[PDB]
Amino acid sequence: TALVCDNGSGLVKAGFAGDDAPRAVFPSIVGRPRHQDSYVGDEAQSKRGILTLKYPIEHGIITNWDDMEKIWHHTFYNELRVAPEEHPTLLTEAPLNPKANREKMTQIMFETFNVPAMYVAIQAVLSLYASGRTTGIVLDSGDGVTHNVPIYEGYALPHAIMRLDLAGRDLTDYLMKILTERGYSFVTTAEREIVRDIKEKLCYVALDFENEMATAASSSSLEKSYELPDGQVITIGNERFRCPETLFQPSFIGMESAGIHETTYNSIMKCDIDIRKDLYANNVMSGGTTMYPGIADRMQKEITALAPSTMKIKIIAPPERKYSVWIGGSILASLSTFQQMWITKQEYDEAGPSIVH
């Protein structure tokens, strides 16, 4: 059988090809004994007191190989429960990943785990392949990085990619910060979870930000209540959309980036003029941080206004967009016509990690 594994800063979604949903979903963290012997995932989170925590993937790029090596070990043996020697493994990388990083992924896959074969693809491509498409621009928005990724006939256009170094993680802080600013106490990492649960259950993108500011002030209709595990009722009103707006107006945390809507526009205008129309109608979204209600609506509005007045603009926000990366990699890796794309061990033995190119 073929394995599918998506390596995020935030979450390692894993499982088997031909499945519609990953069996293993866990934080992307290696833990080691602080003093005086190692855990991965939810077991590294639950024992964060006596273990030194680490995010080997931060911002999409694998930064430390021993840690990520421990996280691949754990994916095989604990979460999935497989012998890696007998399964093709499709691994996903970030956009604009350095060659050296991509060479090291292959070198390690054939040499530590001795896979029968492997392939690497690009997340954005995989969320496109999931929606039925091979052309278009994908908004990929995870825990620690965000991307615009244009794609023509199956392939990402590297020179036209755009990156926003702000994702779900940054919107949690900002919220945490904002509720703090209003009398509340949210310091430790382990209180963060509360705020994150506030962020996901309750936050939303304002279709128009100033109308919405006007609405939250003139009425109680947008006020929400959430009950801490300690007993207090936090009533949030405008916090609900002020948090996610940071995607479109990042200077809410002090950045210089334009929002995900201009970067969607730029990333289209660095493309062949004749493919542009196809991007505009195929603007698919993906990642947990694109899960906010009203995002594809607000995107539509912002692009319409940036794009010539007659341009058909369609934004696709598949209801399962949180897993599309993996869902695309599951589909890809089982089709009959992909099977001879796998780098085999013997191609590798004769060519080296540079074959991955």
């Binding site: 519609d20 039925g132 199956g154 089709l335 016509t337």
Partner: peptide, 21 residues
């Protein structure tokens, strides 16, 4: 110059309904 077109076809034609649960 041959590998793409068939993969494109399987990819665009795929029914996700075909994926196990």
């Amino acid at each position: 110059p041959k590998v793409a077109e068939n993969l494109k076809s399987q990819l665009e034609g795929f029914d996700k309904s075909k994926l196990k649960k």
